[PDB]
Design an enzyme around this catalytic site. Structure first.
Site, PDB file in Angstrom:
ATOM      1  N   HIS C  84       0.831  -1.190   0.000  1.00  0.00           N
ATOM      2  CA  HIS C  84       0.000   0.000   0.000  1.00  0.00           C
ATOM      3  C   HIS C  84       0.873   1.250   0.000  1.00  0.00           C
ATOM      4  O   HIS C  84       2.042   1.198   0.373  1.00  0.00           O
ATOM      5  CB  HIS C  84      -0.927  -0.026   1.218  1.00  0.00           C
ATOM      6  CG  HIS C  84      -1.769  -1.261   1.305  1.00  0.00           C
ATOM      7  ND1 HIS C  84      -2.920  -1.434   0.563  1.00  0.00           N
ATOM      8  CD2 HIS C  84      -1.602  -2.408   2.007  1.00  0.00           C
ATOM      9  CE1 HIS C  84      -3.422  -2.634   0.803  1.00  0.00           C
ATOM     10  NE2 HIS C  84      -2.640  -3.245   1.676  1.00  0.00           N
ATOM     11  N   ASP C  87      -1.659   8.536  -0.079  1.00  0.00           N
ATOM     12  CA  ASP C  87      -1.593   9.801  -0.815  1.00  0.00           C
ATOM     13  C   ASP C  87      -2.504  10.838  -0.144  1.00  0.00           C
ATOM     14  O   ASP C  87      -3.663  10.550   0.150  1.00  0.00           O
ATOM     15  CB  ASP C  87      -2.074   9.560  -2.250  1.00  0.00           C
ATOM     16  CG  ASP C  87      -2.016  10.810  -3.125  1.00  0.00           C
ATOM     17  OD1 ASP C  87      -2.449  11.907  -2.691  1.00  0.00           O
ATOM     18  OD2 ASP C  87      -1.549  10.681  -4.276  1.00  0.00           O
ATOM     19  N   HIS C  89      -4.248  14.655  -0.414  1.00  0.00           N
ATOM     20  CA  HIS C  89      -4.553  15.796  -1.267  1.00  0.00           C
ATOM     21  C   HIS C  89      -4.177  17.099  -0.580  1.00  0.00           C
ATOM     22  O   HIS C  89      -4.040  18.137  -1.229  1.00  0.00           O
ATOM     23  CB  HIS C  89      -6.037  15.816  -1.619  1.00  0.00           C
ATOM     24  CG  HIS C  89      -6.432  14.761  -2.602  1.00  0.00           C
ATOM     25  ND1 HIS C  89      -7.707  14.660  -3.115  1.00  0.00           N
ATOM     26  CD2 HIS C  89      -5.713  13.774  -3.185  1.00  0.00           C
ATOM     27  CE1 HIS C  89      -7.756  13.657  -3.973  1.00  0.00           C
ATOM     28  NE2 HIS C  89      -6.559  13.103  -4.036  1.00  0.00           N
ATOM     29  N   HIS C 124      -6.203   8.870   0.177  1.00  0.00           N
ATOM     30  CA  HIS C 124      -6.565   7.528  -0.279  1.00  0.00           C
ATOM     31  C   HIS C 124      -5.332   6.783  -0.731  1.00  0.00           C
ATOM     32  O   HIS C 124      -4.277   7.378  -0.948  1.00  0.00           O
ATOM     33  CB  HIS C 124      -7.543   7.616  -1.446  1.00  0.00           C
ATOM     34  CG  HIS C 124      -7.014   8.400  -2.610  1.00  0.00           C
ATOM     35  ND1 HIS C 124      -6.030   7.918  -3.449  1.00  0.00           N
ATOM     36  CD2 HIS C 124      -7.317   9.641  -3.062  1.00  0.00           C
ATOM     37  CE1 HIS C 124      -5.752   8.830  -4.365  1.00  0.00           C
ATOM     38  NE2 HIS C 124      -6.518   9.885  -4.152  1.00  0.00           N
ATOM     39  N   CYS C 125      -5.472   5.478  -0.894  1.00  0.00           N
ATOM     40  CA  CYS C 125      -4.349   4.686  -1.331  1.00  0.00           C
ATOM     41  C   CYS C 125      -4.050   5.004  -2.788  1.00  0.00           C
ATOM     42  O   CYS C 125      -4.947   5.334  -3.553  1.00  0.00           O
ATOM     43  CB  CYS C 125      -4.651   3.206  -1.157  1.00  0.00           C
ATOM     44  SG  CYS C 125      -3.221   2.355  -0.537  1.00  0.00           S
ATOM     45  N   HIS C 134      -7.728  -0.359  -5.096  1.00  0.00           N
ATOM     46  CA  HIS C 134      -7.649  -0.090  -3.661  1.00  0.00           C
ATOM     47  C   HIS C 134      -8.672   0.944  -3.209  1.00  0.00           C
ATOM     48  O   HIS C 134      -9.374   0.725  -2.224  1.00  0.00           O
ATOM     49  CB  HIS C 134      -6.251   0.380  -3.259  1.00  0.00           C
ATOM     50  CG  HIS C 134      -5.225  -0.703  -3.305  1.00  0.00           C
ATOM     51  ND1 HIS C 134      -4.382  -0.975  -2.251  1.00  0.00           N
ATOM     52  CD2 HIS C 134      -4.908  -1.589  -4.281  1.00  0.00           C
ATOM     53  CE1 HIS C 134      -3.591  -1.984  -2.573  1.00  0.00           C
ATOM     54  NE2 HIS C 134      -3.891  -2.375  -3.799  1.00  0.00           N
ATOM     55  N   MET C 139     -10.172   1.832   0.680  1.00  0.00           N
ATOM     56  CA  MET C 139      -8.992   2.543   1.163  1.00  0.00           C
ATOM     57  C   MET C 139      -8.910   4.026   0.879  1.00  0.00           C
ATOM     58  O   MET C 139      -8.122   4.461   0.039  1.00  0.00           O
ATOM     59  CB  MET C 139      -7.711   1.876   0.675  1.00  0.00           C
ATOM     60  CG  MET C 139      -7.161   0.919   1.697  1.00  0.00           C
ATOM     61  SD  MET C 139      -5.601   0.230   1.253  1.00  0.00           S
ATOM     62  CE  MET C 139      -4.571   0.923   2.512  1.00  0.00           C
ATOM     63  N   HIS C 244     -27.848  15.549   0.420  1.00  0.00           N
ATOM     64  CA  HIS C 244     -29.089  16.266   0.645  1.00  0.00           C
ATOM     65  C   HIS C 244     -29.597  15.845   2.015  1.00  0.00           C
ATOM     66  O   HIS C 244     -29.573  14.660   2.350  1.00  0.00           O
ATOM     67  CB  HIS C 244     -30.124  15.912  -0.425  1.00  0.00           C
ATOM     68  CG  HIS C 244     -31.450  16.576  -0.216  1.00  0.00           C
ATOM     69  ND1 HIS C 244     -31.700  17.877  -0.593  1.00  0.00           N
ATOM     70  CD2 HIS C 244     -32.581  16.136   0.380  1.00  0.00           C
ATOM     71  CE1 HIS C 244     -32.929  18.211  -0.236  1.00  0.00           C
ATOM     72  NE2 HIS C 244     -33.486  17.173   0.357  1.00  0.00           N
ATOM     73  N   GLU C 268     -29.977  23.211  -1.095  1.00  0.00           N
ATOM     74  CA  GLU C 268     -30.921  22.127  -0.896  1.00  0.00           C
ATOM     75  C   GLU C 268     -30.120  20.859  -1.172  1.00  0.00           C
ATOM     76  O   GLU C 268     -30.222  19.869  -0.453  1.00  0.00           O
ATOM     77  CB  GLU C 268     -32.102  22.249  -1.870  1.00  0.00           C
ATOM     78  CG  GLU C 268     -31.760  22.010  -3.328  1.00  0.00           C
ATOM     79  CD  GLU C 268     -32.950  22.219  -4.250  1.00  0.00           C
ATOM     80  OE1 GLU C 268     -33.936  21.462  -4.152  1.00  0.00           O
ATOM     81  OE2 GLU C 268     -32.898  23.148  -5.080  1.00  0.00           O
ATOM     82  N   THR C 269     -29.302  20.922  -2.218  1.00  0.00           N
ATOM     83  CA  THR C 269     -28.445  19.824  -2.633  1.00  0.00           C
ATOM     84  C   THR C 269     -27.179  20.453  -3.221  1.00  0.00           C
ATOM     85  O   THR C 269     -27.236  21.512  -3.862  1.00  0.00           O
ATOM     86  CB  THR C 269     -29.122  18.947  -3.721  1.00  0.00           C
ATOM     87  OG1 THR C 269     -30.355  18.416  -3.224  1.00  0.00           O
ATOM     88  CG2 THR C 269     -28.232  17.790  -4.091  1.00  0.00           C
ATOM     89  N   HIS C 295     -28.546  12.586  -3.462  1.00  0.00           N
ATOM     90  CA  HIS C 295     -29.793  12.815  -4.167  1.00  0.00           C
ATOM     91  C   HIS C 295     -30.039  12.263  -5.566  1.00  0.00           C
ATOM     92  O   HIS C 295     -30.816  12.827  -6.343  1.00  0.00           O
ATOM     93  CB  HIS C 295     -30.229  14.272  -4.106  1.00  0.00           C
ATOM     94  CG  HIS C 295     -31.716  14.423  -4.024  1.00  0.00           C
ATOM     95  ND1 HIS C 295     -32.551  14.165  -5.092  1.00  0.00           N
ATOM     96  CD2 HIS C 295     -32.528  14.724  -2.981  1.00  0.00           C
ATOM     97  CE1 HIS C 295     -33.808  14.299  -4.710  1.00  0.00           C
ATOM     98  NE2 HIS C 295     -33.823  14.637  -3.433  1.00  0.00           N
TER      99      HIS C 295
HETATM  100 CL   LIG Z   1      -4.422  11.735  -6.325  1.00  0.00          CL
HETATM  101 CL   LIG Z   2     -35.638  14.499  -0.432  1.00  0.00          CL
HETATM  102 CU   LIG Z   3      -4.013   0.151  -0.478  1.00  0.00          CU
HETATM  103 CU   LIG Z   4      -6.353  11.543  -5.367  1.00  0.00          CU
HETATM  104 CU   LIG Z   5     -35.614  15.252  -2.471  1.00  0.00          CU
END
Ligand SMILES: [Cl-]
Ligand SMILES: [Cl-]
Ligand SMILES: [Cu+2]
Ligand SMILES: [Cu+2]
Ligand SMILES: [Cu+2]
Ligand SMILES: [Cl-]
Ligand SMILES: [Cu+2]
Ligand SMILES: [Cu+2]
Ligand SMILES: [Cu+2]
Lengths: 316, 316, 314
Positions: C84, C87, C89, C124-125, C134, C139, C244, C268-269, C295
């Site tokens: 593994h 990484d 961000h 994430h991996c 992965h 992961m 949502h 709302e979303t 949603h």
């Molecule tokens: Cl990345």
């Molecule tokens: Cl809803």
């Molecule tokens: Cu991994």
């Molecule tokens: Cu990434």
């Molecule tokens: Cu809705």
């Protein structure tokens, strides 16, 4: 009455020379492109397709003008081609003369002109009645950048100047398969139409690539920059949503929907560029090494091809 | 009961009932009435039929318009001619699952829902029967409501934006089941199609995506209309899946992609992303006459699946 | 520079921390142990080989303040079978400069970077040549880098939350057989082939919060009280999602999760792009049950992207 200036488009990811801050007033910028239909290998297994392109490349070249300049394009469709083509600019207003006047059959050529009244990066692509999806997903699309008269600005209104600029066109391909599962080859574009539409309706691409093919922007074709350089990356997707991410870096200033009258977003890790849109990201490298540039739907990047490399030099 | 009351008669989309952009009085109780209607509907040119679940007999349901801080009072009627339990969820409401837990009505009953529109913007409203939510929503049971600021719409600088015309474009994704022979299946009753409906929804791939309930519903004769110089507001919603509106030949001068008016609009958008379960609003002023197309910019979804309409603009 | 060690907790919960920094820049130490294991993700008993950080999906939420240094001790015990490579961000550069950070079974490595940008980030991996496998196997997680002076609304005023929950959304691609039944494998290596084939369809068989269908419902529903300000960190390392709050709203939302940017109001979303982490702030005004969903209702009620919020009060 306006002075005219010719420009020589370059094959992407590179961009033709231009001035961030305009050194003059409005002008008529003249561009020229030759449509080219041709077989194209898009992956490492030799998968071939009939691409429809602007200047022999996927994506088409990046055009660069300034807010309020006039864009004049001479589009040529040589008789070596077999299809009709009708270019469409998102930066323009109106029909540009009408389909009958923009449309170009094999053996014809036409000149387009429109005023770039809105600053930002815009998508341009083919729009032939009844076959729009087909041409666009065959590679017939690119982008045009309309810079504000005095360059880009950060959220505070202060200038943002870039040392390098790259144009990454993302293309989704829908290669038809037979019963066995093998991809199919065709002799002419037309023979592919039938199966092409069927593949597109699945809404599931077989390939998603940067600059025309898997790995097109890796190896010795990787993008380059040096520690300390400010890079602007214009990214476009004419048909499907994409989400660019610079592995090991960020989008210091990002115009996800690419319209400069709007102040940029800061410190983006990933940003969504809607299908039918062009976006722009500004980043300053602080360290050397290899930085990947990907569609952050990792299946689309590492399985279907949406990934490139950035080779950055300088001392750690 | 202290607030004055006013009755409004809903109209069939893409049209919107009469209203004042700038509120002429203070908070009021706005009374609306809708009748649920389950019925067979032809969604494409090939006469494909489906069992649609609608509000007031149309897909999408009508656009309700009120002002910030008014009370929305809806009388929802489920006539005994129908066969299913329905209710209604308003993204504009607070608590009681958008009012979904309070509006369950069987055939032959009716209920009156009331809530305060405390947040300005366009919102989606849809049916949410427990255990069958996606099934009802993708059968056409959804619409939108616009809660206008008491002082109307403003631009990114705080200045008023007034529209001369308003259209409500509801985008609907259908998942019509096909048999082993690849053909679309028909049914005697809604409940008779449940099993296949669920299996078709889990593919996550729509067989149809349309504006106003059917392929070409907003083209030709039923094309939207405007004149050169007119400011047009286009409310666009999608209750279940992401969409990306684009006005061919035009732009989104001012756009509220996520539809909430307390946020300043984005400028000069070529294409904008409206998330599934959201309603967006775009403001545009026509400059050239002609036929402007309005599309979902995943061109396959627009030109192969039905998500495309027309704008007939007159003038010089 | 000073160093403190913090203990991570299993999501949706978050380790204690201060919204407004009480000290200056520091080095926050974390420890995570990779763990490959079988996992049941739905109520039909569907099993998969999950690759996890600290034995959970998603991985735990790490919380630091802008300009603090994050130091992670990543352990890959020999009871695992795959290599593994984490990484972040949030980090700049490829962390492992002088040495490689990949860790085969039975090895460990220490990682350190400066959290120069405020916001919520995905981690994430990213193993050479198997990234998507992965990541879609669980992961991934997130890390929040709070502004030193805490969160601010669009008017520059402070926003303080009483509660914070981390909802990791995971898209799974469980391979099926001829008859359409989910396949089972003895080890994660045996599944590789069918896994890549399943991922290439771009169509998830399951999309769940906190690792499984219903993981955030019933007895494990998120809790809050009327009047409380809740911050919900939502991440998706590989696929777009659109949170949502049924019956509620996102009073203040940072859809792409970066705090130097003013939040959006009354959502709302909101769309959270794949490979991104977002944050939503809401103040409960009424008691009762509230659903929290992706949603795209099919993904929510058919695939598993739905959780509950049990709220008490007047
Ligand atoms: Cl990345
Ligand atoms: Cl809803
Ligand atoms: Cu991994
Ligand atoms: Cu990434
Ligand atoms: Cu809705
Ligand atoms: Cl277009
Ligand atoms: Cu073409
Ligand atoms: Cu277009
Ligand atoms: Cu219903």
């Amino acid at each position: 009455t306006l002075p005219r200036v010719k420009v020589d488009l370059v094959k992407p990811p590179f961009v033709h020379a231009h001035d961030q801050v305009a050194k003059t007033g409005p002008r008529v910028v003249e561009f020229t492109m030759t449509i080219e239909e041709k077989k194209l290998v898009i992956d490492r297994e030799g998968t071939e397709i009939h691409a429809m392109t602007f200047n022999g490349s996927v994506p088409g070249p990046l055009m660069v003008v300034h807010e309020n300049d006039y864009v004049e394009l001479r589009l040529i469709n040589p008789d070596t081609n077999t299809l009709l083509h009708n270019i469409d600019f998102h930066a323009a207003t109106g029909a540009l003369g009408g389909g009958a006047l923009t449309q170009v059959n094999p053996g014809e050529e036409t000149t387009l002109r429109f005023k770039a009244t809105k600053p930002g990066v815009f998508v341009y692509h083919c729009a032939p009645e009844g076959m729009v999806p087909w041409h666009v997903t065959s590679g017939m699309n690119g982008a045009i950048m309309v810079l504000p008269r005095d360059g880009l600005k950060d959220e505070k209104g202060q200038p943002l100047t870039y040392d390098k600029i790259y144009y990454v066109g993302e293309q989704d391909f829908y290669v038809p398969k037979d019963e066995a599962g093998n991809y199919k080859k065709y002799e002419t574009p037309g023979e592919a139409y039938e199966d092409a539409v069927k593949a597109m309706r699945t809404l599931t691409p077989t390939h998603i690539v940067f600059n025309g093919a898997v790995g097109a922007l890796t190896g010795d074709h990787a993008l380059t920059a040096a520690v300390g350089e400010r890079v602007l990356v214009v990214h476009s997707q004419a048909n499907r949503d994409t989400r660019p991410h610079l592995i090991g870096g960020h989008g210091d200033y990002v115009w996800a929907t690419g319209k400069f009258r709007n102040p940029p977003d800061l410190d983006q890790e990933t940003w969504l560029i809607p299908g039918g849109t062009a976006g722009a990201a500004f980043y300053t490298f602080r360290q050397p090494g290899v930085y990947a540039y990907v569609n952050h739907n990792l299946i689309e990047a590492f399985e279907l091809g949406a990934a490139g490399h950035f080779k950055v030099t300088g001392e750690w």
